[PDB]
A and B are shown apart, each in its own frame.
Chain A
């Protein structure tokens, strides 16, 4: 069965860093980029970045760079996102999001997002 299951609880009061993770199931891990998204009590959906897992390459949204990085283990078919510091209001339903590699050449339809993902209230 296709799924991508997150790390469980993280809960602490602010100022420490965090690493959050999400492990695939069913699908070839290299057959998808993982992307990471989060809830905001305002806007809801907010995007942080993408891993090309097979390359390890990454790109990131301007808001986050200094804190953020994200990385993977392809041999463990599992993805990581890591943040230097969480605020109380950086508590969110964080999502690992699934994004297929370019099975369509020119990839635009490949860049539909499997934003089903899974969310976790990392706190």
Chain B
């Protein structure tokens, strides 16, 4: 199944400032069949299973963390973080559901 290398291991963002998380992946998440990607980002919360970050490798979740934004194509996952609140300490995930079985990503942690 698709391997999903996340980089860095730890986003060392001293807060306020913008940032990016990246996850290179081996294999396809372009939905050139139906348009868009089958690709989302997810962030595991301190004590709670993940809130969705971003639909379709670009458009934001209904939770409005507009401090975050995204882009990519094919097998680029780019997470870009326009602002950091001190609560953004957390573990950020790329994942695949373009095929079944699923896989979860390697996680990236957040800290100063």
Q: Which residues of A contact B (CB under 8 A)?
A: 37, 43-47, 50, 59-62, 95, 97, 106, 108-109, 111-119
Contact = CB atoms under 8 A, between A and B. Distances in A.
Nearest to B101: A61
B102 A115 contact: no
Interface residues of B, number: 27
Contact of A37 (B49, B51, B55, B101): B49
A111 B97 contact: yes
A50 B99 CA distance: 13
5 contacts: A44-B104, A45-B93, A47-B102, A108-B31, A115-B50
* Chain A CB within 10 A, most for which of B34, B50, B106: B50
Given A97-B49, A116-B51, A43 B40 contact: no
B70 to A, nearest CB: 13
Contacts of A47: 101-104
Nearest to A97: B49
